Design a protein around this ligand. Structure first.
Ligand SMILES: *[C@@H]1O[C@H](CO)[C@@H](O)[C@H](O)[C@H]1NC(C)=O
Lengths: 98, 48, 49, 49
């Protein structure tokens, strides 16, 4: 019988660890917590009983790492809609992209 | 205040399960294979 | 556990069987008992007897 | 945060204040004539009269 996260994660699997990279868009796996984002330095002073920080509406904001206990911030990678300025196909095919 | 309240409940309705086993999409895609994951996927897409 | 062919009733709801090592679980409750032969269906969520 | 964007307005606050300053200077300079046709100047006691 399992429960899926009543506690900090203690029973991991035999998958090999991977060296950490700073300030890049990566697909991390933080003891079963799968998510996307960049990993920057953080100035949020956690008390030592926390293992992760949680943002509004079930999104994870900051995670301390295994084997190092150094605090990390999760910021999502850069996104946004694309937009096209056009004068119309009757006039010209020159396109400004927003 | 009305626009901020509607925006806040639009953000906050992701935390609902809508009958699925978890609100976060990433862990249920991490822990179920698709031909029984898709029942929870359809409920999450329908609710959202 | 998965590659052992002595079992015939792995039969795992909740987390799917084929992707099980990749998650890191928190509390594992390894219970153990011995039962009557046709009571496989009653150890299941919902079936009563 | 999760894919919802707030688009900026086409008219910024300085340009809206420039529109209201154009309206204000137009009414204290002309009365009701600038809203109808060309701006015809007035003395402002004669406008209030
Ligand atoms: C394209 O533009 C020109 C001038 O702007 C106009 O005379 C012409 O009718 C336009 N083409 C169509 C198909 O409307």
């Amino acid at each position: 019988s399992f429960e899926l996260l009543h506690a900090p994660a203690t029973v991991c699997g035999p998958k090999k660890s991977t060296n950490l990279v700073k300030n890049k868009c990566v697909n991390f796996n933080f003891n079963g917590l799968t998510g996307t984002g960049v990993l920057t330095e953080s100035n949020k002073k956690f008390l030592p009983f926390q293992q992760f920080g949680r943002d509004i509406a079930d999104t994870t904001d900051a995670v301390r790492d295994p084997q190092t206990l150094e605090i990390l911030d999760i910021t999502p990678c850069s996104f946004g809609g694309v937009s096209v300025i056009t004068p119309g196909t009757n006039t010209s095919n020159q396109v400004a992209v927003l | 205040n009305q626009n901020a309240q509607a925006l806040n409940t639009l953000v906050k309705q992701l935390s609902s399960n809508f009958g699925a086993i978890s609100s976060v999409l990433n862990d249920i895609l991490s822990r179920l294979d698709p031909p029984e994951a898709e029942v929870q996927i359809d409920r999450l897409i329908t609710g959202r | 556990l998965y590659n052992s062919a002595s079992f015939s009733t792995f039969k795992c709801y909740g987390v799917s069987p084929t992707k099980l090592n990749d998650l890191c679980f928190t509390n594992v409750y390894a219970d153990s008992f011995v039962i009557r032969g046709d009571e496989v269906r009653q150890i299941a969520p919902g079936q009563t007897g | 945060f999760n894919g919802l964007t707030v688009l900026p307005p086409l008219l910024t606050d300085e340009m809206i204040a420039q529109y209201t300053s154009a309206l204000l200077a137009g009414t204290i300079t002309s009365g009701w004539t600038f809203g109808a046709g060309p701006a015809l100047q007035i003395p402002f006691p004669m406008q209030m009269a």
